Design a protein around this ligand. Structure first.
Ligand SMILES: C[C@H]1NC(=O)[C@H](NC(=N)N)CCCCNC(=O)[C@H](CCCCN)NC(=O)[C@H](CCCCN)NC(=O)Cc2cccc(c2)CNC1=O
Lengths: 152, 38
């Protein structure tokens, strides 16, 4: 439970499969709901039980309430700390676009990674996590745009 | 059967590749947490 970015794995029959990614911060593990479907996790500290979650936000936290409070400033470039299955963690910089909804704008990143990259953190220049990657839409040419999803 | 394993520290990288455009997209978010293009 040391601070950092973690892969979320499932053990299956022969070998493990990476289904997602999450962030440990202030003793709480943060990931996207569709990665774990809100089920318990094993860790070196023992079993992590779900504490908070919200299917509409597609988020879940373990061991405590959602701790990530930083937000995109609406202006600056951001970095996806992509942790793709079978690949080393890698930073990719981008200027977000915008998801325009009836209730307001959400920053969004036009970066396309494997499904198991879900939950990878998006950072501001201070290194604060401003959201998690992986809840998005497929646009007309088949490429992908992810919301910058932050716990409300 | 689901478990976590550390993958690194969380830091901004100065040498980072810059890519992707900045699309403006009209979307709806349903109660299931799915975005759809309008
Ligand atoms: C290689 C792999 N790449 C992808 O899956 C996506 N990249 C592209 N598709 N280019 C990137 C995924 C990034 C991690 N995020 C997810 O896995 C979430 C999990 C659902 C969260 C719902 N709350 N998925 C999504 O956000 C979107 C939501 C669409 C909602 C529309 N109403 N679903 C898809 O893309 C499925 C899809 C569609 C077409 C073709 C494909 C896969 C085939 N590709 C693949 O298998």
């Amino acid at each position: 439970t040391t601070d950092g970015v973690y892969r979320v794995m499932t053990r299956r029959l022969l070998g493990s499969t990476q289904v997602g990614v999450g962030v440990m911060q202030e003793g709480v593990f943060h990931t996207m709901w569709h990665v774990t479907k809100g089920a318990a996790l094993r860790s070196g500290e023992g079993r992590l039980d779900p504490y908070w979650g919200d299917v509409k936000q597609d988020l879940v936290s373990y061991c405590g309430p959602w701790k990530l409070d930083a937000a995109w400033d609406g202006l600056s470039e951001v970095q996806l700390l992509a942790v793709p299955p079978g690949e080393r963690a890698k930073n990719i910089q981008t200027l977000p676009g915008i998801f325009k909804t009836k209730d307001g704008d959400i920053g969004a990143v036009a970066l396309d990674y494997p499904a198991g990259t879900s939950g990878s953190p998006i950072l501001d220049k201070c290194g604060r996590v401003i959201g998690l990657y992986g809840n998005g839409v497929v646009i007309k040419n088949g490429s992908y745009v992810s919301a910058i999803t932050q716990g409300k | 059967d689901m478990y976590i394993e550390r993958a690194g520290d969380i830091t901004w990288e100065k040498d980072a590749e810059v890519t992707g455009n900045s699309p403006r997209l009209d979307v709806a978010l349903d109660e299931s947490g799915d975005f759809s293009l309008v």
